[PDB]
């Protein structure tokens, strides 16, 4: 962690702590998200906080915020998520199959996001994505 990183994370913290009270609540979090054009439910906001609220008080103070923003397995879980679609255990997912899953399931990436993903992931350009290589790239 750099001295520059910590100040940048303190600046980011302030954008959420509209209170100035030292903690981010679910309400301040939803306020920021709606300002960006999102409409999260209250349960979605709660799940966001709970993954970060290490003392279980229900809010996020700056050391908790910094802990999460500075954050090990992860690589393996993302591999395991790709392996869900690697039915034959290729180690590979088709660019076509990847675009389909990325665009139409879950968060629904845009086609331009998927373009960027595939251009970076398909190193040899054969239309087949070595997803273990791509997981490495992201981490």
């Amino acid at each position: 962690l750099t001295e520059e990183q910590i100040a940048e994370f303190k600046e980011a913290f302030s954008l959420f702590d509209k209170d100035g009270d030292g903690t981010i609540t679910t309400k301040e979090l939803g306020t920021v998200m709606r300002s960006l054009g999102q409409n999260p439910t209250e349960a979605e906001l709660q799940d966001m906080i709970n993954e970060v609220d290490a003392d279980g008080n229900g809010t996020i103070d700056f050391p908790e915020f910094l802990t999460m923003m500075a954050r090990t397995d992860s690589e393996e879980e993302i591999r395991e998520a790709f392996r869900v679609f690697d039915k034959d255990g290729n180690g590979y997912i088709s660019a076509a199959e990847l675009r389909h899953v990325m665009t139409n399931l879950g968060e629904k990436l845009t086609d331009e996001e998927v373009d960027e993903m595939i251009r970076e992931a398909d190193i040899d350009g054969d239309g087949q994505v070595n997803y273990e290589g791509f997981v490495q790239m992201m981490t």
Partner: protein, 64 residues
């Protein structure tokens, strides 16, 4: 098979978290209701994207 949406969302939040580090990634184009995206938008977007990644991480862990 609830693994499929949870798996997709983990990949997508992870990638979106990675790609927001590139200030000129097309992942910034999704915020259609922001006239001019200033630096304070990007800073909050990066925070939100990290939180969503952690949520997706947990949800995938629970489905597997």
């Amino acid at each position: 098979n609830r693994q499929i949406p949870a798996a997709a969302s983990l990949i997508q939040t992870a990638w979106r978290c990675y790609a927001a580090e590139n200030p000129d990634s097309s992942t910034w184009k999704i915020y259609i209701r922001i006239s001019q995206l200033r630096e304070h938008h990007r800073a909050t977007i990066k925070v939100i994207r990290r939180m969503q990644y952690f949520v997706a991480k947990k949800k995938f862990q629970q489905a597997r």
